[PDB]
Symmetry: none
Subunit: 46 residues, 2 copies
Amino acid sequence: KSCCPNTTGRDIYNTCRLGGGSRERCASLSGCKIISASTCPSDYPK
Amino acid sequence: KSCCPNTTGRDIYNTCRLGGGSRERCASLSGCKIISASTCPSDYPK
């Protein structure tokens, strides 16, 4: 599960994904984290 | 040089660069232009 610090991070991640990027690369490019739970924590809520 | 349309575009571009993205990749995510000269156009001043 990707979890992002804010909406802009989410938008970067999503855009990177839409273009074909891998999850871990897109997380790095966006500031998002890949976690093992399906619900995001309140500090990476987006 | 990266030339960005607005400060959000700058923030996105720089986040992507901080995550190891190439200039071209980060330009695509941000809407910024990569210009190989020092003066940005007025419409991409950030």
